[PDB]
Design a protein around this ligand. Structure first.
Ligand SMILES: CCCCCCCC/C=C\CCCCCCCC(=O)OC[C@H](O)CO
Ligand SMILES: CCCCCCCC/C=C\CCCCCCCC(=O)OC[C@H](O)CO
Ligand SMILES: CCCCCCCC/C=C\CCCCCCCC(=O)OC[C@H](O)CO
Ligand SMILES: CCCCCCCCCCCCCCC
Ligand SMILES: CCCCCCCCCCCCCCC
Ligand SMILES: [Cl-]
Ligand SMILES: [Sr+2]
Ligand SMILES: [Sr+2]
Length: 299
């Protein structure tokens, strides 16, 4: 309608700007309550809350007999998370990785390499069932090594604020992203600038807006571990969660080009984390590869 396609667009961005910040502050206070590293709270609670858009999209698309979008959206998100999301964040707040997280990232690499190998055929529902189970135990393994056993425990009005601040921030970024996207074709439709590729590859970016905005918030507060966790977790939540659910309704066609790309960056992310840093010149490299990715890779 334009306006409601604008007074939306802006309304969503404000719910993204402040929403991401509250979702970060809420998670970081929760992470300190469960005594758990920022990496883990980002790899679990945040990663899944942010990857809810891809899950529902991939599910809805695969069910609607459009499996190409489902897998395309799942892998497209992963590439965006390493290239754009982590790329921007690394420059802002460089992270050096302790040897506790290097192995968690190494697990991520094996996981991705595994999905790529069994994905050459495509993704049968069985292929998805396995991924969904590997995804489940990754979380528990991540919580286990990242946690310590203490008390636990409340009415504690310092935890209720943490919990509430978290879910408000989550509802904020999910709605704020939804408003942004809905507000984005209302502006496009009423100027008659619409077809196929804007109607999709805009929402392909729409599901990635929660990760982007949330990571920018944590990076600006130098909570780099949380960012790194939210990137790794979301990716696994995209492969083991979004993609897997897509395989249940229908066979997902092979995307060996995008997988090979994802593996390379994932490989790059590990090597940087083990022997070097994740700072300006690595983040720059990720963005460059992301630029090349969106410039050259097909429809
Ligand atoms: C080298 C890095 C290897 C990384 C994975 C480790 C062993 C590969 C096991 C592959 C088992 C499946 C082989 C056939 C295949 O590629 O298709 C899978 C099928 O669709 C569904 O199992
Ligand atoms: C390792 C464990 C499985 C070993 C052989 C599976 C052979 C399956 C043969 C029948 C299905 C088609 C096939 O050979 O698929 C191979 C796949 O394409 C390759 O990536
Ligand atoms: C967690 C809960 C998950 C529940 C759903 C799990 C599978 C969905 C149903 C899949 C039905 C597939 C029917 C056709 C079939 O048997 O396909 C065989 C396959 O191709 C051999 O590789
Ligand atoms: C409930 C909050 C803690 C959940 C931990 C899940 C992974 C470990 C399960 C066994 C220890 C509890
Ligand atoms: C080029 C695609 C349209 C860009 C319009 C301005 C930026 C909108 C976000
Ligand atoms: Cl940190
Ligand atoms: Sr997401
Ligand atoms: Sr397969």
């Amino acid at each position: 309608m334009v306006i409601l396609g604008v007074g939306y667009f802006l309304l969503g961005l404000i719910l993204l700007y402040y929403g991401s910040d509250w979702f970060v502050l809420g998670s970081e206070r929760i992470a300190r309550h469960f005594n758990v590293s920022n990496f883990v709270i980002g790899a679990t609670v945040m990663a899944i809350g942010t990857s809810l858009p891809e899950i529902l999209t991939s599910a809805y698309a695969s069910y609607m007999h459009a499996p190409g979008i489902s897998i395309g959206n799942a892998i497209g998100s992963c590439i965006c998370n390493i290239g754009l999301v982590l790329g921007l964040s690394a420059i802002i707040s460089p992270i050096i990785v302790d040897k506790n997280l290097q192995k968690n990232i190494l697990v991520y690499l094996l996981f991705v390499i595994f999905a790529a190998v069994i994905g050459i055929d495509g993704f049968s529902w069985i292929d998805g069932v396995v991924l969904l189970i590997l995804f489940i135990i990754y979380l528990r393994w991540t919580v286990k090594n990242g946690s310590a056993e203490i008390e636990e425990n409340k009415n504690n009005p310092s935890v209720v604020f943490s919990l509430v601040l978290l879910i408000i921030g989550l509802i904020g970024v999910l709605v704020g992203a939804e408003l942004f996207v809905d507000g984005a074709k209302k502006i496009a439709l009423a100027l008659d600038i619409s077809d196929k590729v804007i109607g999709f590859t805009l929402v392909a970016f729409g599901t990635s807006l929660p990760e982007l905005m949330v990571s920018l918030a944590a990076a600006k507060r130098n909570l780099g571990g949380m960012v790194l966790g939210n990137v790794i977790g979301s990716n696994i939540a995209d492969i083991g969660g979004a993609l897997a659910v897509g395989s249940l309704f229908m066979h997902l066609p092979a995307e060996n080009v995008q997988m090979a790309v994802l593996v390379i960056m994932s490989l790059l992310l590990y090597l940087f984390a083990k022997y070097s840093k994740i700072g300006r010149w690595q983040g720059i490299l990720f963005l460059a590869l992301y630029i090349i990715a969106i410039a050259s890779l097909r429809m």
